Amino acid sequence: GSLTEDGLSYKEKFVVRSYEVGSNKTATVETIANLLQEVGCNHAQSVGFSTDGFATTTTMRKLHLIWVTARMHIEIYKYPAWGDVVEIETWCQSEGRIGTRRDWILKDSVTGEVTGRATSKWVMMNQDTRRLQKVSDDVRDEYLVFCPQEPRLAFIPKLEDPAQYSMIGLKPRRADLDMNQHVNNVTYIGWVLESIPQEIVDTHELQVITLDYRRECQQDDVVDSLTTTTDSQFLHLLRLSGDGQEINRGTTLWRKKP
Amino acid sequence: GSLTEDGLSYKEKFVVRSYEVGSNKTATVETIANLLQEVGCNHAQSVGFSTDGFATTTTMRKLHLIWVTARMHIEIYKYPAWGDVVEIETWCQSEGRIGTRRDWILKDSVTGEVTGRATSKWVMMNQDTRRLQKVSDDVRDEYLVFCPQEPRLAFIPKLEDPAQYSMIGLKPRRADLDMNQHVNNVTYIGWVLESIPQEIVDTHELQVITLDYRRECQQDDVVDSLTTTTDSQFLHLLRLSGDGQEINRGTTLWRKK
Ligand SMILES: CC1=C(c2ccccc2)C(=O)N(C(C)(C)c2cc(Cl)cc(Cl)c2)CO1
Ligand SMILES: CC1=C(c2ccccc2)C(=O)N(C(C)(C)c2cc(Cl)cc(Cl)c2)CO1
Question: Has the keyword Chloroplast been applied to this entry (chain B)?
Fold first, then answer.
């Protein structure tokens, strides 16, 4: 991949792999989320951020601050097949003192058609206290020149008991942990979807997913995935085993297979 | 990637991805096993096999047979870092009537130094009955021309109760199922390693894994991973939760970091 002409966005091509696809021989939404993160990480490395975190700025490192996902919104018009080339363009925008927003456009590299779009909201957290805080001038100074400064946009209630559907006792595997031994953001997507009935997954494609991130799942945590029906639309809640804390809430929109 | 000069092997380069690495910022053994499968799948497609199975020949389709892994043996000398370029060469050889053998060599793309090797034995079976079939002349005729004909080589007891270590209630998620709707062969590797104590994983690197595949885990099955100590060496057993039907047995060899 590489920075675009103006150095304010980053493009990368990916060949969809045999193990990245599900029943339809098309990329899973988990694969798409992984590719989105990869092109985001590669953008960060191309403008000189260190590999030790997600675009931790010098001052963020001294103050023990990290970027964490508040929200992820993905819309897929067409999932690319095994062996297809997808091109993903990504950029990051400052959102004043609240945090940063990373956006993505997915294209079929052969046709140039837009096959999907994504947007994510990231906030700053003290890595030690897990408390959120406003982006200071000092931190913004260290990344604003890498961001388009005119707007460039690619583009949830709490599930009530009883849930219509559930998948309980979901556990992180060592493969779900990133370099920092934190649960990968993409695992949460997989967990949300686990409580959708197989009959829906077998006959529908996921068109839209919106996830709110409340709290991390640790390596030794156990998670329950809860789903209620609200094209089919669902409301989602991930919470810790034992009526523990909410970790995620979300919605999905599914379209009938063709 | 592409077929090599003589058309009897396939090479592909991979740039190791951010999410493919663990603690040391080097590729997981699960990532390496996935890349091995991918370069194997891409070889199959380059010599004309369709995506509907793992290199199902015309006659295998008529007889309702598929290739399944009987045994996987991987040795890693050096796990490549995030952003490193690894080159994998792969080829397939007939094993008389027993089945096929796919081998892999992993190299540092820049130095040509061999960083790993793998070999796998694959057998023909009806997925539903699990009944094994010796490779007939008619099936061999449909793939032998894509294989080197002279040998080219890249290069287990049942755990007794009680196991020293265990991880119980392991269940496949939707991402663990392949395009043909069965549990990915790499999931079994992850499950085996789940019962290795954290203290070993934190201080050691996996140098060797040998897995014997006894029968498939279905989408709704629940698995127990059992490990006993035998450089540290372990014996491994994956069995169905409840009835204790054997799914896999294996051994691992770990070196200090
Ligand atoms: C400085 C910065 C950038 C950033 C901004 C402009 C250019 C490159 C990175 C950035 O993308 N950040 C976030 C947190 C959005 C990010 C997202 C992703 Cl999926 C990967 C990385 Cl590794 C990081 C925040 O901090
Ligand atoms: C015909 C064939 C080939 C084969 C033989 C020569 C050239 C290409 C494929 C082959 O590789 N087979 C196995 C089953 C070993 C294989 C392994 C892998 Cl990791 C992927 C595929 Cl998709 C299949 C079996 O049958």
Answer: yes
